[PDB]
């Protein structure tokens, strides 16, 4: 157990840019003398990492953990020992513990109660003791344990000439936890702030915690009174980036270039080479990005009578299948998804899982009861008696079919004679039509009306149901839902709530399912009362009518344009210029903002003198008067 320390005068952490550290092998594959482009979580080049210095001096607060971290300690005498990972550290959530102090590396996953000051430092008098090793106050339920060999350690406590540099990168994804590591000796520098150079990182271990991680704590090594030596570490955060990596014939990573730092790096990435000759090149495409999202559904709050249809007392026979209309309500298919067994629920034109996100214009429910052997005949374009002479669906049917077993209700031990069906029909019937006329089948060469006999048949036949019948012949209840999509103003659909309306701004609009991106303005055209959506030459909707308020909105896409880079040879200076093809030059100052533009780099927009040509405006070059020969 630890003892309260306090008595700390905290000082804001230091900052220092990291030049080229933090690159690791992305896969366990050997490649020799080839440039490879990868996209994964990396450390951006020339990013400002946080510097912590501990000498009296005690600086080790909790730090956020998200999308993996890069931890680099420049140390000599093995002061930093382990790490703590967790989200609450209150014995209510699972927590990691990685301790490699002296014996081995111990990795424990358990509901630890980490005390206020986790450390192994303060012991009598100024030399370390392996006491308070139970930094966790309690361990209720521990679910993972793993032990392996330790790293390179050191003896005694020194102050100065800090040779060893240990770099680690930790990343968790899809439950897995991954650690890459590297050790560099003989790194002595009178100045601080990390060495300059390149060095790759190898994969060390992998382990499946499968838990939630959001913050981490560093560990280092009576309670009152202690003097500690020099120690320094640096913390940086990862993010998704694309890199170009160069291997050599020996199979080791030698150099790497970022592809989102500078326009010169962008053109290096797109040329797939580390040198570019003098000229004008075409690079990644400019494009502005959406700020907020809006939705718009009709103002209806009633409920659809699906319960009455699915809990009806009596179902009509096949030759008189019942048809009902659902309109002007809110349909929730969740109750249909779970309640009752519903042994068959199969849709054709739309995946049922998304059925709660669309909007329809007319919904028709057709209900009947059939035998268990004919349920497979409900599919469109089928054959057989029931799919030909009693009920047939069109080939392009767009809806759903639900069939479930109802042996308890319809079947009767004495015998259920109430159910009838046509057995003889003169010719195949058109889709979605009904036949009721009772005319004796004159299937012979004689003018027979009669009652019964040869070639004189009563077409109707009676289903008979009883519990003694085996599986495959007990009655099944079938309901078919049919609808057409997007062709008319919506009338019935799901319960998604609406929001406000935005004008003259780039948003992610959603009008009755029309997911899209663009800017919405007020139009000056007139619609017909039976029209809702306006199309164009390319058959892409560009005029919409708001459902809640009867207004006409016109959609236009976001601003964009080409980008070119003017550069002298890489053998000469690395200064470059940028040209925004075919755009007025007052839009790009407006575009200046973070998280707004596809090209992450934006230092050049507020750069040197801007000069408008007839093909955009050039930024980064001054306009002289006298004329030369074209270069």
């Amino acid at each position: 157990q630890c003892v309260n320390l306090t008595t700390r005068t905290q000082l804001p952490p230091a900052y220092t840019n990291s030049f080229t550290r933090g690159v690791y092998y992305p896969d366990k594959v050997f490649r020799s003398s080839v440039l490879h482009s990868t996209q994964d979580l990396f450390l951006p080049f020339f990013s400002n990492v946080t510097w912590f210095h501990v000498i009296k001096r005690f600086d080790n607060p909790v730090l956020p953990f998200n999308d993996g971290v890069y931890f680099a300690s420049i140390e000599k005498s093995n002061i930093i020992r382990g790490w703590i990972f967790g989200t609450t550290l209150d014995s209510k959530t699972q927590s990691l513990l990685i301790v490699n102090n002296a014996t081995n590396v111990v990795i424990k996953v358990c509901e630890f109660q980490f005390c206020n000051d986790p450390f192994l430092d303060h012991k009598n008098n100024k030399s370390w003791m392996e006491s308070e090793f139970r930094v966790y106050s309690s361990a209720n339920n521990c679910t993972f344990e793993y032990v392996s060999q330790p790293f390179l350690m050191d003896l005694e406590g020194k102050q100065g000439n800090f040779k060893n540099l240990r770099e680690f990168v930790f990343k968790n994804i899809d439950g897995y936890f991954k650690i890459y590591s590297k050790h560099t000796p003989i790194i002595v520098r009178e100045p601080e702030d990390l060495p300059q150079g390149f060095s790759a990182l190898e994969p060390l271990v992998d382990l499946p915690i499968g838990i939630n991680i959001t913050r981490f704590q560093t560990l280092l090594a009576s309670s009152s009174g202690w003097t500690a030596g020099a120690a320094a570490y640096y913390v940086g955060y990862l993010q998704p980036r694309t890199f170009l990596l160069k291997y050599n014939e020996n199979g080791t990573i030698t150099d790497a270039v970022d592809c989102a730092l500078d326009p010169l790096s962008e053109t290096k990435c797109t040329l797939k080479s580390f040198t570019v000759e003098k000229g004008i090149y075409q690079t990644s495409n400019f494009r502005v990005q959406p700020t907020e999202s809006i939705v718009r559904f009709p103002n209806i709050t009633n409920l659809c009578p699906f319960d009455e249809v699915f809990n009806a007392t009596r179902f009509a026979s096949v030759y008189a299948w019942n048809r009902k209309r659902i309109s002007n309500c809110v349909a929730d298919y969740s109750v249909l998804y779970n309640l009752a067994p519903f042994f068959t629920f199969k849709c054709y034109g739309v995946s049922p899982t998304k059925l709660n996100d669309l909007c329809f214009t007319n919904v028709y429910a057709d209900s009947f009861v059939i035998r268990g052997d004919e349920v497979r005949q409900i599919a469109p374009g089928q054959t057989g008696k029931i799919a030909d002479y009693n009920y047939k669906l069109p080939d392009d049917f767009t809806g759903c079919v639900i069939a479930w077993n109802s042996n308890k209700l319809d079947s009767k031990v004495s015998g259920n004679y109430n159910y009838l069906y046509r057995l003889f029909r003169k010719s195949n019937l058109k889709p979605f039509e009904r036949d009721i006329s009772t005319e004796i089948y004159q299937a012979g060469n004689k003018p027979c009306n009669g009652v019964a006999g040869f070639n004189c048949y009563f077409p109707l036949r009676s289903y008979s149901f009883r519990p003694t019948y085996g599986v495959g012949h007990q009655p099944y209840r079938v309901v078919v839902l049919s609808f057409e999509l997007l062709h008319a103003p919506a009338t019935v659909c799901g319960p998604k709530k609406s929001t406000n309306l935005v004008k003259n701004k780039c948003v992610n609009f959603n009008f009755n399912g029309l997911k899209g991106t663009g800017v919405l303005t007020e139009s000056n055209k007139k619609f017909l009362p039976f029209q809702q959506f306006g199309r164009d030459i390319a058959d892409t909707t560009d005029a919409v009518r708001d459902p809640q308020t009867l207004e006409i909105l016109d959609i236009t896409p976001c601003s964009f344009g080409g980008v070119s880079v003017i550069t002298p040879g890489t053998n000469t200076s690395n200064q470059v210029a940028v040209l925004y093809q075919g755009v007025n030059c007052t839009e790009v100052p407006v575009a200046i903002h973070a998280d707004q533009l596809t090209p992450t780099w934006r230092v050049y927009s507020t750069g040197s003198n801007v000069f408008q040509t007839r093909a955009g405006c050039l930024i980064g070059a001054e306009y002289v008067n006298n004329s030369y020969e074209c270069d």
Partner: peptide, 30 residues
Amino acid sequence: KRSFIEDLLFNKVTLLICAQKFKGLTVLPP
């Protein structure tokens, strides 16, 4: 700075669909 025949030549040869060319189709200048 044009002659007389060049004026007729320019006027006798003609060069809103560009608005509906939003689909990534441009025309660079000579």
